[PDB]
Amino acid sequence: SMSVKKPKRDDSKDLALCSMILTEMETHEDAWPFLLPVNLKLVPGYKKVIKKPMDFSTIREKLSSGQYPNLETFALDVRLVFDNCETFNEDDSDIGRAGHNMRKYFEKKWTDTFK
Numbered sequence: 001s002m003s004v005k006k007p008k009r010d011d012s013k014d015l016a017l018c019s020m021i022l023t024e025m026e027t028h029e030d031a032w033p034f035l036l037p038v039n040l041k042l043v044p045g046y047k048k049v050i051k052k053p054m055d056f057s058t059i060r061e062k063l064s065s066g067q068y069p070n071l072e073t074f075a076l077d078v079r080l081v082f083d084n085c086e087t088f089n090e091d092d093s094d095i096g097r098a099g100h101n102m103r104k105y106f107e108k109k110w111t112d113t114f115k
Contacts, residue, residue, distance in 0.1 A: 030098040054080040
């Protein structure tokens with residue numbers, strides 16, 4: 001509350017560390033469904049169904065241009081990529097499996113880096 005603060009957690013390395021995690025996600029072999037925005041002209045249903053599209057290239061541009069106010073807003077966009085994937089893809093498809101694998105990979109890195 002006013003003039004009463006919890007001790008200051010050091011956040012000065014968060015930008016660099018999120019960039020590293022994102023680089024590791026970009027270079028995973030199962031990243032291919034997630035590298036670029038889904039083409040909304042060429043993929044029937046996507047525009048109407050997925051209210052907030054997200055992809056790694058878009059997260060990379062947001063990161064580089066100071067559009068994440070803190071590390072939680074970064075993790076929300078990453079998770080949004082996987083949540084969108086589950087919404088639109090069967091679990092037993094190549095893309096559906098890719099998304100489960102990438103989410104698992106992301107969450108471990110996140111815990112190991114910050115928790």
